[model samples]
Target chain A: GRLRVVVLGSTGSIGTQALQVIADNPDRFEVVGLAAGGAHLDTLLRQRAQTGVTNIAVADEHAAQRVGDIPYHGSDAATRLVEQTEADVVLNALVGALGLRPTLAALKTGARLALANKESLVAGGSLVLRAARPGQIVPVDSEHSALAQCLRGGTPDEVAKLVLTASGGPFRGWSAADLEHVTPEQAGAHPTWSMGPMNTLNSASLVNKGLEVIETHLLFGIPYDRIDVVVHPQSIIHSMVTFIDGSTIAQASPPDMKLPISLALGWPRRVSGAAAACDFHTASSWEFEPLDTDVFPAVELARQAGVAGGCMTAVYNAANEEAAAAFLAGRIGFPAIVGIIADVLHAADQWAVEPATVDDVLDAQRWARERAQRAVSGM
Target chain B: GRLRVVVLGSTGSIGTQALQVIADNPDRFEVVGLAAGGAHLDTLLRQRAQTGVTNIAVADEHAAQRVGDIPYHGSDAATRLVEQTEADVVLNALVGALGLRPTLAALKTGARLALANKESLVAGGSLVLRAARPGQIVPVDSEHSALAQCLRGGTPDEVAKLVLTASGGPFRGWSAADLEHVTPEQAGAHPTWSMGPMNTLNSASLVNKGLEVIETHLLFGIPYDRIDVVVHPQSIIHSMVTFIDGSTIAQASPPDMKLPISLALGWPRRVSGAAAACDFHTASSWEFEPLDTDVFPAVELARQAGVAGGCMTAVYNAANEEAAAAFLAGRIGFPAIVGIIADVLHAADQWAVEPATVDDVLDAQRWARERAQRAVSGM
Candidate 1:
């Protein structure tokens, strides 16, 4: 029998592609459960019917009640799914800090997690890691997964550096003056990867890559100084792992999430069609430049938040969520997204309390999200 | 105490650089023996005096007679050094059929071999492999060593293909007609690496890579077809290993031979400063294209001869040497090197003999060299 997998944000970009990976390798993987957001409960039910999935979960309890006989509901729905559902793996593609509970829940059941949700690692770094069993989280993000693939080459002690590549986003080469008047449409346009606002705008600001750097530190135990970010416009060289002796091992494909998704789904073995083979014959050459940290401050913010640990990282993720929402709704300027997040970060340490529990993380996350929202509104 | 290292061919191109590696790591390695060619006797003597090496070898019988207490002489001098010398490692940087005996001899003593000599494996694939003990031969060639370095990532069974990079040579885009009129100097001038005339002509026609293809097969036990040649003009991306899991691990540095030499000397652990680290900050872009098999047919010839086994590989290496010599002597054109070798390869089957002995290999090499010389001189 094929290995059973559950998709937590089945309606999202990463989840939609996760299904495609399953579609590609029907014999290698099976979808046993699907948990969509409040908006997609009906779609989740239809998906359950379509794929012969045994379980469904939704964060909205009232709507979860409306769906007759669906197994999970409310804020703790995924936690219930992690306990009740029969699965070999759980894929968390949920966009916000809401994914933290599901990630911990999945790991507690000792089911492997294919994680696309930055919040689970970013907001719940210490907690998720402590809860994680051996090799429990298989990263679905392109950078972490690519680095993980390269890590199979050498021992951790032999590692010199972890290099993550950024596509330089849509606003690359644009001056700060130009960024001041930019609209949501400008931030949402990615030159290489196609995705929605959450990632598209974060990519433009370099905050997504920043979050990934933080996630990498929590996940792999590499120091913040050892991990580097480079701006590669073509996005073919996904990322690289440089060894102690200066030999760099890089993983590349023709820019697709399905590749890492398929790779994460099949941990020790490969199931073939993750993405199209990287074709140099069809594509042009690749160029790399040092990441312009002055132009893109997200990676620095991530490093700061990641190094501080505890409540700060939760605030980093939470503030960015509020800031992105503000930018999308015309409540803040383009630069104001990072500005709002930075203000919330400056105020975070004053609360001076460590996030030791889910409620601590959640309560801190709510406070930061409100702080960032008020900062955007006041601006 | 430092690991004892006995170096064969300590005065030629690769030999000179091998000494530099030992010099760079004096605390890590001690030179117990030094083998010098006839031409570099004075330099080798000076080297022995400087390094305080106790044993010496000379293929030049005159020099061997002159040294009062020096240990070895003749074609099989390295073999004697390997068996008789007090060393933990044998770095074979010699040229011609002579290296095969030393490789076999080195393994008989169970000493590690950092092999730079193509003849050791190209003409003696099976014998060398049979003689090899576990961890015996550490490749010193840029591509194979680079591939070996990448192999540290996974088990050999997981390896899907070996991607070897070619510098497209000094005359990369030259037409066959244009190549026919070119001189030795044109072929000798490499675009990226500063190397001897020994490999200069081979690089120009891609025949050097051809020999390397055979060498890789013998050294690593990877099949001929699974070892692929890709034209990467930069020479920075030394090589790559594409695993079955659709993930590739690549090795890159500022193209230098000393890196592999140093790496081979300190394998299972890397020694820093083989060459300068690859710097993208100072470099431009990277490019890759499929090899132009129509023009650079050495890789195809290599695969055919490598698969043919035994004497055919000897012919492949020998015919190229004869053709390159003919081109060097101005008796033949640039295009004649591969053409003569191909013709000799076509005629090799009439005598389709497997070399069961070193004498057989040498005799086969001589016949192939003569066959190629006759074909080109008569042209």
Candidate 2:
């Protein structure tokens, strides 16, 4: 039987690529629901008509006005999309803090979450981990997927360390002074990964890598001390698991997003696809170097946030989101994003809060956003 | 109970190293017998007294006449030493064809044959493989040991290729003309391996590597077509096993003979000692090049002999042994050693007899010795 899958942000970058993946492996998956931010109504309607998907949700009033007959769920549609859609797997490609509600709702409905949204975990790591059962949440991130592959033949106790490979983005060799003059366009132009403006900027700052470090901890049940990040510029070697016996097992392939998505969708079984093919004849070697914390403050800050746990991660996510938005709008510079996040994190003094419910996370997100906005305005 | 071990060619390179490994892991193995040729009689006697092993053997009868109060098995004493010693493991370290009888005797008595003697396998591959039943034979040779380690957690079907790494010896870059003028001293002074005249000459001709290829086939039950050899000058990476999945797993360490010996003794469990501590800090990178088969015709000739199994291997082994002996005696040059073997192999008609019994092998060895002598005398 084919698995029924719903893309939470169908019109977005990851969602579109995932649909293409699903289209390619049509025998394996059935796309049932299509939901978007409602700005791309034409794209959403086209996807629904092509896939023959009945359930649709939109965030814009204009999309609701335009596509009235499509059984449109309005405004707070992400939660309804999760609850109402008959999907066996919910691929949360939602970008920011908006991913949290859909993730929680999908988990509540006992649907496996194929999570690409790092912010959902960064915002509510403890809360999200508590919601996921043993096999409920599968990471779509390449590094996490590679780490999971390495952990297949061995126990967690046998694992000495996890080495996550990073492409080091566009400004890999840039100094701290050079990074201070980095424009939003310059920061957004990533060397390896073809991603969104926010993510590309995050990749440049190593904030994306920082989020992965925290995500690795939650997914593998390994401590922060055991998880390490190394800059592998080729990004072909996704990650490595060094065993206690000094043997390092690495998962390598061509840098393809579909490979991780396919792995997430079809857990425990490797499917045949051209995506997994590694062409060593013309392929260049992967080079590794230590992470430059001086140029990329986001890594150190994320490390601090990951260790703090609870509401601290939520603050870090929200602050980064607000700072990224401000940076894109030319309200703040590239380095000030880290400064704003630091300020927001410091102001929100380690609140003793357990975010079991969606409301608890919402409250934390709201607090971080307000603090970050004020920090940006002052700057 | 700890396994009692006997080093048949004690005071030689492999024998002394085996003792060093035993001394490093005293709780695991005990040396019960020490034997050597006449030149190392004092060292052998000292080793025998220290280990309290009274059963001593020597190649020379004059050396046996000199050592007092010891029940000596002179000249053809390796076989008697193996039959009488109550050792669980018998390390046959004697060079050339002389080590063959002790190996057979050890295996017949159900004692593990920690074989350093390549000639035993190269000459009697099928016979040795037939003799192996469960816990009978374990190769102490680094190349075979590496292949054995890589074969763990995999079946025969999973193995694609067995690649044996050669240090390419001292005359790696020498052309045929350059090799023609090469003397015995230059050939004996091998860049990497510490071995005797016959073995060093074998290393220079890559006959040692050829013998190893045949031995690997016997030990692993792999076909000759699947085995390959490459020249790696450093000799750090002992060997590599490329699986069906296109993934290559290599076992590497510093060039230490004791590592393989100790590993064979402590099978199914790894022991901590001086051998286990491989310092990779100094020689970090490894380099590889194709073997100069045009200059080294012995490599191709050995391959042909390996493919033409049974008595061909015996002929190949015995001819090389005699040629190496002639070179060591200044009766021939380095190039003539290979020339003599080639002449003998070409002149001798193909034998249809399989070495099904030990007597068949001895008969073939006797024929090869006379044939080799005739070739040398004609030259």
Candidate 3:
């Protein structure tokens, strides 16, 4: 019997690679549904044809009409796609707070979620954990996936701390004054991995690492203080978990997303040949240093938001998203991307309370976006 | 309800460290018996006085008689000590093929063997694995202990390969020409770790890594072909296991023997504050390269001996021991340490046949020693 997999954010980077993994392991997996934001309708149409999946969904109403008799459409299409379609695993590749609803829906239906979307955990920390059962959600992010693998070495109580490694992005050792002069093109060309525009820019400023820190805490049930971020420029050692016995188990490989994607899709069983192992036949050097939080303040800012808990994480994420877009649009410089997030978090009042439902979390993000917009305008 | 423990070779480097770990966690462990080669009777007396243990054993008759009323004495004292004493776990930190009898004795009594001695597995091979139950033996050698930790990530079938790291020692990249002129003083001073003179010299010649490769194969039940050796100058990453899913889990810590000793002592559990974690607050670089098989042929020779199976591994270890002693006695150049072992292995006829008892293994070692002595005299 093959696993019935649903691919959300079907046309995006993680989404397409996930589909490739599913397609490659045809005997082990079958696609049950495909959902996207409707920007890549052609790719979605081709995927449906390729996987022979009739259950399709699109967020755009006009694009849903163009999709012609597809079962799900409108803003809640991804949620509905998971709700109506039967699946063993749902790969939630959808970006930002939009993924929270589908994440909850997947958990409600009792499907294993191969979570590529960070905001689901970033914005929906305890709520998502509370909604899911043990081992219900598996992280698709390389660092978190690494942690999950290393955690297998011992029981939960045996672990002492979690260390997340970062590639230190483009402006690694730059001063705050130097960061103010950085352009979108400079940040866009990432050093290690090629990713989406938003993620590439996030990696540049260390906001991505900060978000990962929150994700690590929520996923592993570790405190914010126990989680650490180290700058490893090569990115070969994905992450490490220090056990109480003074042993640290680390997950390492050449820079490849397919390993984690395949591991996530397969769950407890590893899919063979998902990615190439590290070539130790060749000589190499791996360097590690403390992450300089003073210049790239996004990691520390995200840490403060994470420690606050509840709606504050959503606020931090929402503010960064707004500021990121402004920087990419050339309306603000690179430093202001994190600067605006800090300012918005400083002024946050409504976000202090815990969210009672998914809507309350969304409302907090909306409030944060408006506040972040005001700060960007002032800049 | 502390674990009743027996310490073999209690005065050796690893033995003393194991005692320190056991002493530090007094609530978790208690000493029931102590055994040694009797060169350090003073230290043994101090240990018995500290732990208040009545049962003691010595290989030398004079040393045992001088102690006046100790339970076991002479040739098989270590083996007799384990046979007579009630123990929950046996820390076999003994060196050479002489440790094999005590190892077998510990297993026969159904005690978990925290084995620091590599010769037990190198010489005993299938004999040990066949004697012990599953999870009955926990490795105390840093590389095998590291592999044991990493192997927890997946099932046995999920493991792809095991890569054992070599510190490359004092003569890392030296050619055969350079090695022929190497002195005992040069080989005795190891770069990464401090150990007994024989073990230190074996590390410089890569024979220790060779022994570990064979140990890894026998302990983990992996074949010789699937086990790899890489030269990592920094002994930080002890060893790695590549799962069939393409993800590699590596156990890393600074060059510390106590960590593995603690982990082995506390199997299936971790001793808190066993060792200090890696200081990521400071910057560091780890370098790795392929082991030059031409320069250090011992690894490949051991692989060949390992592939031959049965008593061939016994012959390999026995011959290496004799050659190493000869090199330390200033009779042969460093290159001849492995060369004499190779010559002796070529003449191994009795060792090709599998031994049916402990006496047969001892007979094979005696055969190899005589053969190795002949080659050393010819030099």
The number of the candidate with the highest lDDT is 3
Question: lDDT for every model?
Answer: 0.81, 0.77, 0.88
lDDT of 1 by residue, B171-239 (tens): 777777777778777777444443567577888888999998898888788998788887788887888
lDDT of 3 by residue, A144-245 (tens): 999999999899998899999999998887877888789888987444443678878888989999899989988899888889899999999999999888
| Candidate 3: regions farther than 4 A off | A189-195
Per-residue alpha-carbon lDDT of model 2 for B1-379, expressed as tens digits? 7889988788888888889888877889898887787687768877876777777877687777787655655666878878888888888888887777777888887888888887887777677777778657888888987777666423556567788888888899888889878877788788877776777778888888888887887787788878878787878668766554343445655677877787677664455544533232221345667787778777777777777777888888899988888888888878887787788777656543678888888888888899999988986
The candidate 2 chain A region of ten consecutive residues with least summed lDDT is A276-285
DockQ of each: 0.51, 0.13, 0.87
lDDT of 3 at A364: 88
TM-score list, all predictions: 0.95, 0.73, 0.98
Candidate number achieving the greatest DockQ relative to the actual structure: 3
Q: Which ten residues in a row have the lowest lDDT in candidate 3 chain B?
A: B346-355
Ranking by DockQ: 3, 1, 2
Among the numbered candidates, top TM-score falls to 3
* Ten contiguous residues with the weakest lDDT in model 1 chain B: B189-198
Worst 10 residues of 2 chain B by lDDT: B276-285
DockQ, structure candidate 1:
0.51
Stretches > 4 Å off in candidate 1: A41-46, A61-67, A280-283, A351-353, B189-194, B350-352
